[PDB]
Homo-oligomer: A and B are copies of this chain.
């Protein structure tokens, strides 16, 4: 099954046309959506005007287990992967624009698997050995996660990182600045300008995102379903572990 997929930026993001999202999508459509999500890291559906609160939730249950029963309304300008201070953080979110500012209000995502790939090989080999502590709860995650479906390595960082384990504070900051800098390099990101009825889904195992705060008092209301994720595995097979 080939969806009508239109890549947005060169290294991340794709709009999918010709699909009306709903709890009744057939199994091939869902699988092609999951494939497009792994490949493109964030995917977009425009004009989902029919998709009410109940129908977003039931569509979401097709893609994983949610963490109306699960639909949250949000009425975050710092780069982060979702809830990484816990051990088995979300694998994905499904996010629908309900009220969109006439100007401003964008969201940006970064492709943390492309960020990992572009490091020189000695620097990839360092990153493969690093562990960081993430805090709001404190959890230790490998800096490099091996994705459980695609096997792609991705950098696991963002603003919940409190420090890189086994380094002085100064060295931790330098190493984080280098690796996080590759994440948010413009070439690894896609920025989306929302219209009401847009839906984005991203793979939280291989992205970070950032909500641009440039819209002043213009109202902005989005509704989110989050899907439950797995314990990260590092390159040498070790798993993340909550410590506090």
Contacts and interface: CB of A to CB of B under 8 A. Distances in A.
A214 B40 CA distance: 14
Contacts of A170: 178, 181
Given A10-B105, A210-B186, A212-B186, A178 B181 contact: no
- The copy count of this chain in the complex is 4
Given A7-B102, A130-B122, A187 B175 contact: no
A10 B214 contact: yes
B186 A9 contact: no
A175 B212 CA distance: 24
A173 B176 CA distance: 13
A125 B129 CA distance: 11
B9 A103 contact: yes
Given A9-B212, A10-B215, 7 more contacts: A8-B103, A9-B193, A10-B104, A10-B212, A125-B126, A186-B191, A186-B214
6 contacts: A6-B103, A9-B212, A10-B212, A10-B214, A120-B167, A122-B130
